[PDB]
């Protein structure tokens with residue numbers, strides 16, 4: 001674990017999650033992007049889906065934080081909400097498995113998800129919304145806490161939560177709308193070990209609409 | 221559709237230059253076409269594509285205008301952007317609406333007057349990739365519809381805004397292109413007078429943008 005913290009120190013972790021339904025949401029293109037960022041020097045990835053985690057882990061050698069995102073009709077929890085998802089991700093080749101650690105309505109308790117991960121041997125990453133979710137994660141022996149779910153229960157990333165997780169002594173991953181290299185740099189000096197970035201890198205439709213909105217507004 | 225129609229159609233628009241890095245797992249015509257399809261869904265009104273086969277493959281899949289180019293590394297010359305009229309002929313037959321070319325006054329296999337004239341003869345609009353103001357003045361003298369700041373500094377890190385002002389105050393149909401890496405830099409391009417702005421690395425070069433992020437997170441992580 002201290003090996004992983006030293007390996008990920010000062011690193012940008014690349015979230016390869018194309019927008020759903022896109023021409024780019026294809027396992028072919030996800031793997032190629034995975035090979036591509038590793039060739040460019042990325043030290044770690046966040047991959048969504050058991051098949052994709054399996055596919056990318058057979059093509060690259062850098063660590064994978066695995067997830068399965070499901071939008072349920074009965075719950076607001078999305079990030080790996082079932083113990084069966086934990087088991088498939090581990091057999092797919094993920095090193096860290098992230099899950100929703102909020103105290104919200106859930107098909108399975110957050111305590112039960114966390115112990116399913118530990119049962120595999122994978123490290124656990126807790127995607128949190130508040131500081132209290134990090135304390136809960138720490139009480140359960142969770143190796144990583146992240147600011148992934150802050151604001152999703154907003155446009156600027158939440159620096160105060162990554163500072164507080166760092167002021168507590170947690171292994172803190174800043175994640176959520178760190179959209180420029182300057183914003184991801186201030187996360188590290190905010191205390192993060194690493195920072196995870198997705199939309200600004202692997203969601204072309206999103207970054208495109210960021211540009212047109214600002215060029216079009218000027219053109220009026 | 222005449223030139224001012226394109227100018228009204230492209231006013232305030234971001235033109236997405238889809239040119240993955242050479243040798244990448246991503247430098248594939250499939251993945252290019254996918255990106256072309258996807259940015260058109262997101263509302264992009266124009267593209268820049270490189271290579272006759274890509275222009276062919278993209279023009280069959282989208283309906284937005286394509287600015288065609290051919291990039292060649294010549295052993296005898298520093299010019300890379302469409303230096304041959306045979307490249308001009310394939311680009312027009314590939315479906316290009318606009319064809320861009322190097323408009324610098326450097327050593328080249330075929331004269332620049334001929335390339336600009338070969339493009340016009342096709343019916344496609346012509347765009348001059350310029351590095352200096354006089355390269356733009358030359359382009360306008362030849363009946364060239366579009367001048368761009370594409371090559372300023374490549375003959376630097378901040379965009380060359382003074383050239384877009386000069387091209388725009390001369391009355392050219394000015395295309396801002398080069399190092400507009402953030403939506404704010406592209407908004408300042410339009411207010412500098414550009415009709416449109418072309419953005420490439422920050423959108424369709426994953427290896428480049430990745431290295432932009434690690435460069436800043438790792439430099440911070442030296443503490």
Ligand SMILES: CC(=O)N[C@H](C=O)[C@@H](O)[C@H](O)[C@H](O)COP(=O)(O)O
Nearest residue numbers: 015148152175176177178197198199
């Ligand atoms: C809220 C939620 O479910 N976020 C997901 C969790 O992994 C991802 O889609 C995000 O992209 C990730 O948090 C990285 O943030 P950003 O994409 O802004 O760089």
Ligand SMILES: CC(=O)N[C@H](C=O)[C@@H](O)[C@H](O)[C@H](O)COP(=O)(O)O
Nearest residue numbers: 237374398399400418419420421422
């Ligand atoms: C100088 C040269 O040959 N530029 C090339 C011309 O097409 C491309 O590699 C650039 O990506 C393009 O100009 C877009 O610029 P930027 O990637 O800065 O947004």
